[PDB]
Ligand binder design. Structure first.
Ligand SMILES: Nc1nc2c(ncn2[C@@H]2O[C@H](COP(=O)(O)CP(=O)(O)OP(=O)(O)O)[C@@H](O)[C@H]2O)c(=O)[nH]1
Length: 157
């Protein structure tokens, strides 16, 4: 359903110590989970693996999919950030999320695989910290994502 919401996939990568991977936006001081659009003809899961390698340098063999979200979670952009006169105009995102366990070493994370790298650093953070730190208009989504994944993450410790 074309609703003004652009289809998107997000990635929560965890370890065995209750932590998730938190990535620093390239040349910036702001942080986020990896995320990116789902292309026409693509499944959310295929899009997830693609952006996992493009943004984090990890492949299918480096992770286990522990959980995912069946349904969209939507946020609307802030009115001022709405890019008017663009095609297609986008009033927010509708997102599926995947919870991945990192089963390779931390050294396999490589954020330089693309020619326009999305991030320039990363660090482990406790799994609920992103909920408090994500830009305001994403917070309801992140609350729902982490509440769905919290039990699984903790069952590894
Ligand atoms: N001041 C801040 N602005 C933010 C933050 N996160 C996102 N944004 C702003 O909102 C815009 C949309 O960010 P989104 O993450 O929803 C999708 P984005 O367009 O950034 O990804 P690309 O496909 O790589 O262009 C983005 O271009 C920034 O201007 C943040 O932590 N702080």
């Amino acid at each position: 359903d074309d609703d003004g919401y652009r289809p998107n996939v997000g990635i929560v990568i965890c370890n065995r110590q209750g932590q998730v991977m938190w990535a620093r936006r390239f040349g910036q001081h702001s942080w986020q989970f990896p995320q990116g659009g789902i292309n026409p003809g693509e499944s959310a899961e295929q899009a997830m693996y693609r952006e996992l390698f493009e943004e984090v340098g990890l492949s299918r063999k480096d992770v286990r999919i522990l959980a995912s979200t069946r349904n969209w979670l939507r946020y609307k952009l802030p009115k001022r950030l709405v890019r008017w006169d663009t095609k297609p105009v986008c009033i927010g995102q509708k997102q599926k999320w995947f919870l991945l366990q990192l089963v390779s070493g931390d050294a396999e994370i490589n954020m330089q695989t693309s020619s326009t790298p999305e991030f320039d650093g990363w660090r482990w953070v406790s799994y609920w910290y992103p909920v408090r730190q994500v830009v305001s208009f994403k917070r309801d989504v992140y609350r729902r994502v982490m509440a769905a994944f919290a039990s699984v993450v903790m069952s590894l410790q």
